[PDB]
Amino acid sequence: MNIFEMLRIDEGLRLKIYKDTEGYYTIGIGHLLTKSPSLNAAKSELDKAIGRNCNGVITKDEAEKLFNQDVDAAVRGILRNAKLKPVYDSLDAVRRCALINMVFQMGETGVAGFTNSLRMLQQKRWDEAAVNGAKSRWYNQTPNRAKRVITTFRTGTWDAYK
Ligand SMILES: Cc1ccc(C)cc1
């Protein structure tokens, strides 16, 4: 299993503009287009991201391109983030993936807010981190996804995904 396969399970793949769980316009494999209520704004954003007149629809190929860019962006974001980098550097391969997943989902800022959890991760206090990270809006809004990422952090294995 790898990051792409992981994220592909958690986000799905939709070729037509759709509303994510918070009601935001998205497309592909979890690619947020805009936080604005307007489908037009969404459609504009899409054309601009794709480089053509998509008319709210993209191809698999296009979805995968956006996905490749977003995953790269998440990794580079972590590596540039003063708060995130050390955590990332301290983790084993599987757990790194879990951190990449969260960042992809909620952005650097959002993840950087799990101060106490990050600290525990850094101290290799797996069980405590899992319990603390569960006390969050994130967990309460998308419990199933959250549980899968949390188990990955807790155990360092891909069990939650197999
Ligand atoms: C940021 C974060 C760290 C650890 C867990 C278990 C959940 C979230």
Domain ranges of the chain: 1-162
- Cα 125 from Cα 75, distance rounded (Å): 23
How is the beta sheet containing 31-34 ordered, strand by strand? Answer: 14-19, 25-28, 31-34
* 3-class DSSP string for 18-63: EECCCCCEEEECCEEEECCCCHHHHHHHHHHHHCCCCCCECCHHHH
Asked if residue 34 lies in contact with residue 41, where contact means CB atoms within 8 angstroms, the answer is yes
Ligand 1: centre distance to CA 38 (Å): 33
User: Does the annotation mark 159 as catalytic?
Assistant: no
- Cα 43 from Cα 54, distance rounded (Å): 8
- Cα 106 from Cα 139, distance rounded (Å): 12
Ligand 1 nearest-atom number relative to CA 134: 7
Resolution given for this structure, in angstroms: 1.9
Identify which of 81, 118, 74, 80 has the alpha carbon closest to the alpha carbon of residue 97. 74
Count CB atoms within 10 A of the CB of residue 33.
24
Which stretch of DSSP H or E encloses residue 15?
strand 14-19
Which stretch of DSSP H or E encloses residue 27?
strand 25-28
CATH architecture classification, 1-162: Orthogonal Bundle (1.10)
Q: Which of 81, 100, 102 to mutate to test the pocket of ligand 1 (most atoms within 8 A of CB)?
A: 102
Asked if residue 137 lies in contact with residue 149, where contact means CB atoms within 8 angstroms, the answer is no
Q: Which of 10, 20, 62, 70 is catalytic?
A: 20
Provide the 3-class DSSP secondary structure of residue 31.
Answer: strand
Experimental technique for the deposited model: X-ray
